[PDB]
Amino acid sequence: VNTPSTCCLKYYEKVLPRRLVVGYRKALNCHLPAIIFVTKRNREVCTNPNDDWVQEYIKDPNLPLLPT
């Protein structure tokens, strides 16, 4: 659309501890496709959708998809 999107410009280079993550948002339609993890520290973290740990957290039955 002509409406702005939430998009990532860089990927996080480390693994977020699972215990710190409370949800995720999809930002896959951007120039750099990303998954954004929402944390207990009230931070939003851009990550590589293709990385193994990211796909593990996405598949976690207790982690909700949140809107952007």
Residues in touch with a second copy (CB under 8 A)? 1-13, 25, 27, 29-32, 34, 36, 43-47
The pair of structure tokens assigned to 35 is 């998954």
> Smaller CB distance to a second copy: residue 9 or 52?
9
The end-to-end CA distance of the chain, in Å, is 14
What is the H or E stretch that residue 45 is in? Answer: strand 44-47
Shortest approach of a second copy to residue 32 CB, angstroms? 8
Residue type, 15: V
Stretch that binds Na ion, among 7-15, 31-39, 40-48, 55-63 (CB under 5 A): 55-63
- Distance CA(13)–CA(33), nearest Å, equals 15
Q: Is 21 in the site for Na ion (CB under 5 A)?
A: no
Q: Which residues lie near Na ion (CB under 5 A)?
A: 63
